């Protein structure tokens, strides 16, 4: 979830 929802 660090680069997206």
């Amino acid at each position: 979830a660090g680069x997206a929802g």
Epitope: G2, X3, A4, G5
Partner: antibody, heavy 115, light 118 residues
């Protein structure tokens, strides 16, 4: 954990660059991986990002002549860059840049020379 | 995009260098921002991530700070070993739903050459 770009070298203008990023000790497909390049004596430049969710996002300059794809079966990601010119001479890196994650990993880079 | 200043700076051994980055849009989650050190012929070495978290094995005289669109790297008690080029890099992401589509990218700053005066 480590990654490794395939061999670069001398390439004719107008040709196609194909570079393979091979992973060891972990699964490439569980992380988003970018291709970054650096022209001789210039700064780092993002090409595109293959998100963990499988979508590829390209820098605007790269979108029309780049393709980034994953091979889960072989634990590779591949960069294809078409219509090369001298401006594409650079060191090319495979990297999880790690803007926020604990994990960050960079290949040693490979020199691609257009002449 | 990322505007990194100054592009060149110098400090005496024991001094302090400050490097700034300004992003035209806000970084993802107001968190996704790393700083890298690169010496000639080497891979970039990550110094800091999530704006202010020290990467493993990085000295505590490197300090990252900022928020939103403005970010700073401070090198305290600078040493000859700090002579290098430094880069900020932000991550950006928007959308992600069917009706929004999605877009993501990273933006590296132009870099800062740091000369250490011995």
């Amino acid at each position: 954990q480590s990654v490794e770009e395939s061999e670069g070298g001398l390439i004719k203008p107008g040709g196609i660059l194909t570079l393979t990023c091979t992973a060891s000790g972990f699964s490439l497909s569980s992380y988003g991986f970018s291709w970054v390049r650096q022209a001789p004596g210039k700064g780092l430049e993002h090409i595109g990002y293959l998100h963990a969710n499988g979508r590829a996002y390209y820098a605007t300059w790269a979108k029309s002549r780049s393709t980034i794809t994953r091979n889960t079966n072989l634990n590779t990601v591949t960069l294809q860059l078409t219509s090369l010119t001298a401006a594409d001479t650079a060191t090319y890196f495979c990297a999880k840049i790690g803007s926020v994650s604990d994990v960050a990993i960079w290949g040693p880079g490979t020199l691609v020379t257009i002449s | 995009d990322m505007t990194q200043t100054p592009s060149s700076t110098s400090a005496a051994v024991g001094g302090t260098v400050t490097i700034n980055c300004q992003s035209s849009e806000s970084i993802y989650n107001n968190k996704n921002l790393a700083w890298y050190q690169q010496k000639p012929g080497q891979s970039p070495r990550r110094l800091i991530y999530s704006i202010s978290t020290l990467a493993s094995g990085v000295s505590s005289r490197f300090k990252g700070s900022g928020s939103g669109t403005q970010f700073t790297l401070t090198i305290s008690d600078v040493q000859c070993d700090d002579a290098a080029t430094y880069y900020c890099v932000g991550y950006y992401y928007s959308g992600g739903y069917y009706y929004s589509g999605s877009a993501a990218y990273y933006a590296f700053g132009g870099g800062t050459e740091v000369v250490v005066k011995g």
